[PDB]
Structure 1
Amino acid sequence: QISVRGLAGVENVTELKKNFNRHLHFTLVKDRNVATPRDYYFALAHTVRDHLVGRWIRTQQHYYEKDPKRIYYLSLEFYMGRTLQNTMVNLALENACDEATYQLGLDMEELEEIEEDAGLGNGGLGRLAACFLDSMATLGLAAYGYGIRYEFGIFNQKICGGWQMEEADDWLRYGNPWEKARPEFTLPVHFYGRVEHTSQGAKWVDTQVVLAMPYDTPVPGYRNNVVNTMRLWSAKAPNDFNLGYIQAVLDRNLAENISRVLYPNDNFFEGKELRLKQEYFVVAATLQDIIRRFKSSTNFDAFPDKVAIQLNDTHPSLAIPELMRVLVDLERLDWDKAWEVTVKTCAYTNHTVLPEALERWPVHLLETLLPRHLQIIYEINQRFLNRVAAAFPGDVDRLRRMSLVEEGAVKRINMAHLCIAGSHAVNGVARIHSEILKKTIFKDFYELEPHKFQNKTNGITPRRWLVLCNPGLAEIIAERIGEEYISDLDQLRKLLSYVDDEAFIRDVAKVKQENKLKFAAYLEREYKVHINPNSLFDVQVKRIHEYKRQLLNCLHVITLYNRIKKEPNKFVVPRTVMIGGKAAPGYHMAKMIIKLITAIGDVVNHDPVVGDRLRVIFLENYRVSLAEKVIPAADLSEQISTAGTEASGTGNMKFMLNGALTIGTMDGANVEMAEEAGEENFFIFGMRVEDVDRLDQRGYNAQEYYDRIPELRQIIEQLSSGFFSPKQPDLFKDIVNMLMHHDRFKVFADYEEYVKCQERVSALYKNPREWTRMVIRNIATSGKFSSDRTIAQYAREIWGVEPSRQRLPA
């Protein structure tokens, strides 16, 4: 039907239909009289999976003949979402499958909705690892993602009486057609034990053993016939485990618990033993697999020429002392040579400067769990601090700031300091975030080794985040400029010549309106919720966290409502304010923010005086597949973190690519986006990083703002006196207290500029044609934010390998 969806050849369509019927019979053991839509989903998934396999085997065979340098991306998170449509997109099968299933009397979109998300991540750091895998495959790199196959991913969020409830995300319940278990490549991982010193060096003994069993999932490049591997480890007890006979068998659960469940905190460190086991487990299994693959290519000098390991934040930072352990204890390399190899192999990406998000593990934990790694870490530390001492003689304070060991209450290991010492490259994830690292938290390290520090601004894949979720837009774009932009997103610049083209203006706006109607209807079907699709769709979707300032958005919504109640018969641009995202289970403030949002909707949505001029909707269970629906439907993207706190953001990029305009602070990647599109085509407001620093030197006093802004004082008194909670007038006193006395994120300080910037958005929205022309200028300069650009810079500037756009043979 639409051209970017590929060819529906007579031969291909006939083949698909017969393979579909074959899997329904032989794989699912069903016939058409008894098959449910779920059976039909599976028959289609197995049919599409069959097309991957030849390419998968051929790709891994090619890497074996050519022996290129291999890239290993280690992450505790891979937030993959659904796989069926993505695989059709990259194989150019979408129109053929659509034709084939329509001929069998099925609606392929209905079947797509049955697939569970693979929710193996929390938010932007896990989704970044997913876009990156897609980009590495599209650029033909010999790349493997390594992680943990969690049996339960991020929880499903239900809202009850306006509060978040969590329920287990049992995503494997019906099976997962995309993974292949590889029980034959199972590997042991050791925990506890003790260290013995021999004349022959150290030996780690009396350990408990857990087995790591791999499951491989294919990752197709965009039409290049490349299929790389995502290898995820599952924990298994050994068979003589303990071996009541009955209790000994039931206790095998203790081992297997390692891979049971994703820790749901995001941008917040919890120093729990089970989380540390998961970190060491992924690292110990992955490095044996790497060294094995390297040996089947004695001489470890060539290791860094044949291997790169990229650490996704500090979560796999144990790779560094584990590599040393293997090289020194097992392979008997001397320390200095082992260290040289390690540093040249590893690189570290940082994704935060929030102090609560930094991993600092108690020494007593590492001592019991990983006694040999703590000894290695002490030694790394001693030699590193001898280099600091030589470079800055007498600077005893620098010695204590830079140490890997933090002195104090409980001694801890600063995992970020360890990564910087044992990596040849450290990067931040947006230009302002990388500059902040050099000037504040890693300033001492930068002074020591300036050449290690780099920037790699984040990106998103344009396959998932345009072609897949917004085919209407990808299509009016390809009509004018062809299809090559899908893997060369810079070509979108050519659209700047269409900014005054009347046909284009109208098509861009027609596509948005269609996305809006489709999403308005999804809301009613799947949630009985009623919206005006003519309203401006004002959307803030991301994890709930105080730094993201969903609370500033709430204050704006209450101001708009109060203004209406004051002058009811005045005209206002109608809005649908949608806010969604999950809160970590013990992050009390974040759960209270969810409750506030729904409590506002309760008042605002049933006030007859408002009518349909204002609606506040909490979008439940926000996750990758929900992103794919709401993002194409949005007009306005809320990116309103306090300057200096959103390291990059990526949701911001998705919205820009999909024809929403952005209201935001000069934070993270928002700075580079404004610079690409021009500041006149973005709605920037609020303190810059400099302004935040100046307010901190003086002292932030929220009372000052409350005293000087009568619209703000009114909202606070409404919150305090029970206006939004009539049956429990003091429900929101923790929120008021925090805003009044300990707001780390200065919500009041940005309030006036934010409300005034929102009036400018409403003014532009009144003029459809100039709103759309500014939209065009955003889409057209979104090219820099493709993850293919990001990954080509990692390849060239960190990994030392060349991307490639050439097809492997079909």
Structure 2
Amino acid sequence: QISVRGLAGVENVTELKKNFNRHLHFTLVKDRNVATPRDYYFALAHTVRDHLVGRWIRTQQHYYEKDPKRIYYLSLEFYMGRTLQNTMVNLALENACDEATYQLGLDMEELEEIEEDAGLGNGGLGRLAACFLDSMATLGLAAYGYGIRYEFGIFNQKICGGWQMEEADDWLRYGNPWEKARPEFTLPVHFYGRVEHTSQGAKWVDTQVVLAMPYDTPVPGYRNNVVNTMRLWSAKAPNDFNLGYIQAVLDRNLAENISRVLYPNDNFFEGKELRLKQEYFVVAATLQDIIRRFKSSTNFDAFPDKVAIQLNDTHPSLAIPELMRVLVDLERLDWDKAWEVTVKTCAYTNHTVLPEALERWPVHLLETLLPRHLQIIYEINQRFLNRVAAAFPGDVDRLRRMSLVEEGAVKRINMAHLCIAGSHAVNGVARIHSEILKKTIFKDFYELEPHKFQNKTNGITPRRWLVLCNPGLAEIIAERIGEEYISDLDQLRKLLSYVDDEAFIRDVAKVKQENKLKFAAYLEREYKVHINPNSLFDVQVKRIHEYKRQLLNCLHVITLYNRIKKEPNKFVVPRTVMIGGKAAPGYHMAKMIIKLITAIGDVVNHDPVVGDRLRVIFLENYRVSLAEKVIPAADLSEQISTAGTEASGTGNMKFMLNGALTIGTMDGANVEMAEEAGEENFFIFGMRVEDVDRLDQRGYNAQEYYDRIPELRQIIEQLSSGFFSPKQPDLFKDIVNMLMHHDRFKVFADYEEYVKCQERVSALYKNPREWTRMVIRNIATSGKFSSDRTIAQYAREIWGVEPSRQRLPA
């Protein structure tokens, strides 16, 4: 049907169908009469997975013959989403399978909706990992993603009476056709025990053994026949485990709990034992796999020339003392040499500056669970602190501030400090975030070793985030400039010579109308709710957090509703406001925010006076495959965190790429986005980082805003008096309370300039053709934000490998 989806050759289509019928018969053991759409998805899924394997085997062999430096990306999160379309895309099979399946009298898109998301992450940080792996394959790097194969991913979100209900994400119920279990590479992981000293150094003994079993999942690069591997460990009990007989067997579950469930907090540290075990588990099993692969090529001098370990935040920071452990205790290298190797091997990426999000482990946990690693940590601290003292003599304060060990009621290990000491590079995730690191929380570490600190502004993959979710737009782009930009997104810049082209203007706007028409019909079919598609689609999708300021959005929405009710026969530009995302189960405030958003919808959506000029929809169960739908259909993207709090953001980049305009604050990657499009093509408002600093010095008093702004006073009065919750008038007392006395995020201080900016947004929307020319200016400048650029920067400036766009043979 469409160009970018590749060739549908007679030979390819006839071969596809015969393999589909082979899988339905031999693999699924069904025939046409009994099969359900789920059997059809699986037959297609196995048929597509057949095209991977040859390439998968040839890529693993290529890397053995050629022996290049290997990248190991340790993450506790890989938010993969669905695999079938992405696989077809990267193999150029999309139009072929479509044809083949239409010929068997099936609808391929309806099959695609049966695939479960692999939701092995919470949001941005897990999804960065997924985009990264795609980019690493497309750029021919010899790279491995390592993590944990959780039995249960991010919970599925239900709304009941406007409240969030969490049910378990049993994503493996029907089988995962993409993974290959590999029990032959099972590896022991140790916990507890104690430390013995001998003539021959330290020995860690009397440990409990948990087995780690790997499952490998293919990661195809974009049309270059590279297929890399993501390896996820699963926890297994040993067979003499505890070995009532019955109870002994039942208690095998205790050990296999380690990989059962993904912890559901975004940007919040919870210091639970189970979590620390999961972190140790992935680090221990992965390092032995790494060392084993290094050995099959005695000499660890070349270890850093052959291995790179990237730590995705502090979650796998125990890699550092674990590598020392293996090197010092098991390979018998002396400390100083081991340390040299570790530092040159490891690098660390920070993803936040929020104090509550930093991992800080109780010493009493590590001591029980990992007593040797505690010994190694102390040893690292001592030697570190002697360097600090040598360079800044007499500065006792700096010494306590830099210690990996925090003192106080309960001793903690600051894990961020650990990573800086033991890594050769440390990077933030957008330019303003990297500066903040150097100016504030890592200032002391920067003065000691200025050379470690870098920046690597995030990116997203244009394969999923354009070609896959938006074939309409990809295609009209391709008609004018060719296919090449799919792996070279800078080329989008050539779109700038089409900004005054009448035919392109109409095509950009038509794709956007089509995506809206389709999403509005998804909203009726799957969720029985009725929206006007001629409105401006104003969407905020992302995890629910106070710093993300969903409440600021709520305040805008109430304001519009109030202005409509004040002058009902005045013309307003109609909007559909959509707000979505999960709240972590224990994050009370977050869950109250969700309740507020639906409460506003219960009032606004049923006012006859409002008409369909204003609708508030809470988008239920937000996740990767819902992002693929809503993001293409958006006109306005809301990126309205308080300046200084959102490390980078990546949703911001998804929308820019897909024809939405951005209302946002000067935060994280928003800053470079505006810089790239020019500030005129962006809706920027509110405090800059320095303005927030000015406000903290004299102090934030919210009462002042309540006092000087009647429109805002009225909203608070409405919240308080039970206007949005008539049956429980004091349901929102917590929110009003926080807003008034304890708002760490200065919601009111930005309210006035936000509403004003919102007016300017409505004004451009009134003029379709200028709206669209500005859209073109955004899309045309979105190239910087490709994860291809990001990974090429990691490769040259951190890992020491040259990327390569050359195809491997078929």
TM range (shorter): over 0.9
For 1:353, the equivalent position in structure 2 comes to 353
SS at the partner of 2:631? helix
CA distance in 2, matches of 1:376, 1:61: 37
Q: CA deviation at 1:673?
A: 0.1
Q: CA deviation at 1:233?
A: 0.2
SS at the partner of 1:206? strand
CA distance in 2, matches of 1:530, 1:406: 55
CA distance in 2, matches of 1:640, 1:28: 49
Q: CA deviation at 1:501?
A: 0.1
CA distance in 1, matches of 2:698, 2:110: 58
Q: TM-score, normalized by length of structure 1? A: 1.00
Alpha-carbon deviations, 1:160-205, whole Å to 9, x = none? 0000000000000000000000000000000000000000000000
Q: CA deviation at 1:547?
A: 0.1
CA distance in 2, matches of 1:409, 1:47: 59
Q: Unaligned stretches of 5+ in structure 1?
A: none
For 1:25, the equivalent position in structure 2 comes to 25
Alpha-carbon deviations, 1:19-67, whole Å to 9, x = none? 0000000000000000000000000000000000000000000000000
Q: CA deviation at 1:418?
A: 0.2
SS at the partner of 2:680? helix
SS at the partner of 2:505? helix
CA distance in 2, matches of 1:679, 1:230: 40
Q: CA deviation at 1:505?
A: 0.1
SS at the partner of 1:737? helix
CA distance in 1, matches of 2:355, 2:39: 48
SS at the partner of 1:193? strand
Alpha-carbon deviations, 1:679-724, whole Å to 9, x = none? 0000000000000000000000000000000000000000000000
CA distance in 2, matches of 1:656, 1:500: 20
SS at the partner of 2:408? coil
SS at the partner of 1:491? helix
SS at the partner of 1:547? coil
For 1:396, the equivalent position in structure 2 comes to 396
Q: CA deviation at 1:675?
A: 0.1
**After superposition, where does 1:737-752 map in structure 2 within 5 Å?**
737-752=737-752
CA distance in 2, matches of 1:747, 1:289: 48
CA distance in 1, matches of 2:76, 2:410: 26
CA distance in 2, matches of 1:122, 1:324: 31
Alpha-carbon deviations, 1:106-157, whole Å to 9, x = none? 0000000000000000000000000000000000000000000000000000
Find out whether 1:149 has 2:149 as its counterpart: yes
SS at the partner of 1:32? coil
Find out whether 1:614 has 2:620 as its counterpart: no
CA distance in 2, matches of 1:800, 1:409: 43
Q: CA deviation at 1:622?
A: 0.1
CA distance in 2, matches of 1:242, 1:132: 41
CA distance in 1, matches of 2:408, 2:83: 47
Q: CA deviation at 1:762?
A: 0.0
Q: CA deviation at 1:524?
A: 0.2
SS at the partner of 1:207? strand
Alpha-carbon deviations, 1:602-621, whole Å to 9, x = none? 00000000010000000000
Q: CA deviation at 1:595?
A: 0.1
Q: CA deviation at 1:509?
A: 0.1
Alpha-carbon deviations, 1:617-671, whole Å to 9, x = none? 0000000000000000000000000000000000000000000000000000000
SS at the partner of 2:547? helix
CA distance in 2, matches of 1:266, 1:145: 21
Q: CA deviation at 1:518?
A: 0.2
Alpha-carbon deviations, 1:575-607, whole Å to 9, x = none? 000000000000000000000000000000000
Q: CA deviation at 1:672?
A: 0.1
Alpha-carbon deviations, 1:430-463, whole Å to 9, x = none? 0000000000000000000000000000000000
For 2:710, the equivalent position in structure 1 comes to 710
Residue-pair matches, total: 810
CA distance in 1, matches of 2:329, 2:530: 65
Alpha-carbon deviations, 1:317-366, whole Å to 9, x = none? 00000000000000000000000000000000000000000000000000
Q: CA deviation at 1:376?
A: 0.1
Alpha-carbon deviations, 1:282-333, whole Å to 9, x = none? 0000000000000001000000000000000000000000000000000000
For 1:448, the equivalent position in structure 2 comes to 448
For 1:125, the equivalent position in structure 2 comes to 125
Alpha-carbon deviations, 1:509-551, whole Å to 9, x = none? 0000000000000000000010000000000000000000000
SS at the partner of 2:79? strand
CA distance in 2, matches of 1:230, 1:216: 6
For 1:223, the equivalent position in structure 2 comes to 223
CA distance in 2, matches of 1:650, 1:266: 15
Q: CA deviation at 1:498?
A: 0.2
For 1:531, the equivalent position in structure 2 comes to 531
Alpha-carbon deviations, 1:767-801, whole Å to 9, x = none? 00000000000000000000000000000000000
For 1:467, the equivalent position in structure 2 comes to 467
Alpha-carbon deviations, 1:241-292, whole Å to 9, x = none? 0000000000000000000000000100000000000000000000000000
CA distance in 2, matches of 1:668, 1:138: 26
**After superposition, where does 1:231-310 map in structure 2 within 5 Å?**
231-310=231-310
CA distance in 2, matches of 1:394, 1:780: 55
SS at the partner of 2:781? helix
SS at the partner of 2:692? helix
Alpha-carbon deviations, 1:453-475, whole Å to 9, x = none? 00000000000000000000000
SS at the partner of 2:308? strand
CA distance in 1, matches of 2:728, 2:103: 58
SS at the partner of 1:196? strand
SS at the partner of 2:338? helix
CA distance in 2, matches of 1:55, 1:118: 23
Q: Unaligned stretches of 5+ in structure 2?
A: none
CA distance in 2, matches of 1:266, 1:769: 39
Alpha-carbon deviations, 1:200-233, whole Å to 9, x = none? 0000000000000000000000000000000000
CA distance in 2, matches of 1:297, 1:99: 45
For 1:192, the equivalent position in structure 2 comes to 192
Q: CA deviation at 1:744?
A: 0.1
**After superposition, where does 1:79-98 map in structure 2 within 5 Å?**
79-98=79-98
CA distance in 2, matches of 1:408, 1:150: 35
CA distance in 2, matches of 1:352, 1:493: 31
CA distance in 2, matches of 1:45, 1:123: 26
CA distance in 2, matches of 1:60, 1:479: 36
Identity %: 100
SS at the partner of 1:214? strand
SS at the partner of 2:128? helix
Q: CA deviation at 1:382?
A: 0.1
Q: CA deviation at 1:417?
A: 0.2
CA distance in 1, matches of 2:267, 2:385: 29
Alpha-carbon deviations, 1:358-396, whole Å to 9, x = none? 000000000000000000000000000000000000000
Q: CA deviation at 1:104?
A: 0.0
Tell me which stretches of 4 or more aligned residues in structure 1 moved more than 4 Å. none
CA distance in 1, matches of 2:807, 2:535: 45
Q: CA deviation at 1:568?
A: 0.2
Q: CA deviation at 1:86?
A: 0.1
